[PDB]
C-alpha cells in the first residue's frame, strides 16, 4: 500500500542476494582486509558524489523535494575525510575507479538527468541501508582493521546530524509516502530500487574478483 511498504516487500529477495554476495558475507563475519575496505570506501565516494550531485540538481522538483534532507544525510564530506586517511593527501588522484563503480555512477546520472522521478529509489536504498547497518559494520571494521589511534578513517559510519536512526527512518518513510506519482511511475520507482540492489551486487562481485583473482 504505502510506497515504503511496497519498496521493502519488492526488494526483499535482491536484498538477501546482496547480503549473500561473498564479499559482504565475509565482511559480516569479520573477514575484511585493509585492501578490501579501501576499495569499498572508494566505491561509496564515487557513488555518493554522483547521487548527491543529482539530489542537488533536483532538490526543488516536486518529485524529490519532500525527501530532501541535506544536513541529516549528506555523506560526501565524511567520505572525503576518510579517504584522506586511507589513501593520504593525494587520495583524489590515486583512488581507483573500476567498471562496476562507473556503472553505478552512470545510472545515477541518467536517473538524475532524464528520470528524476526515480531518484528516490536510489536515495532510499543508499541512505537507509547505510544508516541502518553502519553501527554494526563500524564495530566489525574497527576490530578487523586495527586502526592507529589517530581519530579518523570511519566517519562514514556516523551520521552526526541524526540523533536517532529509528525516528529519522520513520520521518523519511512518511515523506516518501507523500510523494505523488502516476501508476506507471510508481512501478518504475519500485523497479529502480531493484536495479540499485543489483548495481550493489555487481559491485561486490567485482571487488571480490579484484581481491582474489
Ligand atoms: C552493506 C551492509 C549493510 C548491513 C549489514 C545493513 C543492515 C541493516 N539494513 C537495514 C535496513 C535497510 N537496509 C537497506 C539496504 C541494504 N541492506 C544491505 O544489507 C545491503 C547490501 C543493502 C543495499 C545495498 C535498505 C534499503 C533498508 C531499509 C529497509 C526498510 O526499512 O524499508 C536494517 C534495519 C533492520 C532490518 O531491516 O533488518 C539493518 C540492521 N544494511 C546495509 O546496507
Swiss-Prot record:
GO MF terms held by the record: enzyme binding; heme binding; heme oxygenase (decyclizing) activity; identical protein binding; metal ion binding; protein homodimerization activity; structural molecule activity
Keywords for this protein: Apoptosis, Endoplasmic reticulum, Heme, Host-virus interaction, Iron, Membrane, Metal-binding, Oxidoreductase, Phosphoprotein, Transmembrane, Transmembrane helix
Gene Ontology CC entries for this record: cytosol; endoplasmic reticulum; endoplasmic reticulum membrane; extracellular space; membrane; mitochondrial outer membrane; nucleoplasm; nucleus
Superkingdom to which the source organism belongs: Eukaryota
Domain notes: The transmembrane domain is necessary for its oligomerization.
Disease: Heme oxygenase 1 deficiency: A disease characterized by impaired stress hematopoiesis, resulting in marked erythrocyte fragmentation and intravascular hemolysis, coagulation abnormalities, endothelial damage, and iron deposition in renal and hepatic tissues. Clinical features include persistent hemolytic anemia, asplenia, nephritis, generalized erythematous rash, growth retardation and hepatomegaly.
Name of the protein: Heme oxygenase 1
Higher taxonomy: Eukaryota, Metazoa, Chordata, Craniata, Vertebrata
Residues of the whole record sequence present: 11 to 223 of 288
Amino acid at each position: 500500500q504505502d510506497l515504503s511498504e511496497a519498496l521493502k516487500e519488492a526488494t526483499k529477495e535482491v536484498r538477501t542476494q546482496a547480503e549473500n554476495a561473498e564479499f559482504m558475507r565475509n565482511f559480516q563475519k569479520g573477514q575484511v582486509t585493509r585492501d578490501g575496505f579501501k576499495l569499498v570506501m572508494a566505491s561509496l565516494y564515487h557513488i555518493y558524489v554522483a547521487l548527491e550531485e543529482e539530489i542537488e540538481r533536483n532538490k526543488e522538483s516536486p518529485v524529490f523535494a519532500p525527501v530532501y534532507f541535506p544536513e541529516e544525510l549528506h555523506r560526501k564530506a565524511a567520505l572525503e575525510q576518510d579517504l584522506a586517511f586511507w589513501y593520504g593527501p593525494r587520495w583524489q588522484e590515486v583512488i581507483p575507479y573500476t567498471p562496476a563503480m562507473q556503472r553505478y555512477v552512470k545510472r545515477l546520472h541518467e536517473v538524475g538527468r532524464t528520470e528524476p522521478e526515480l531518484l528516490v529509489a536510489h536515495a532510499y536504498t543508499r541512505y537507509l541501508g547505510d544508516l541502518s547497518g553502519g553501527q554494526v559494520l563500524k564495530k566489525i571494521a574497527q576490530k578487523a582493521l586495527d586502526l592507529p589511534s589517530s581519530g579518523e578513517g570511519l566517519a562514514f559510519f556516523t551520521f552526526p546530524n541524526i540523533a536517532s536512526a529509528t525516528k529519522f527512518k520513520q520521518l523519511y518513510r512518511s515523506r516518501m509516502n507523500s510523494l505523488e506519482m502516476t501508476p506507471a511511475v510508481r512501478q518504475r520507482v519500485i523497479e529502480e530500487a531493484k536495479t540499485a540492489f543489483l548495481l550493489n551486487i555487481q559491485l561486490f562481485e567485482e571487488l571480490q574478483e579484484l581481491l582474489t583473482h
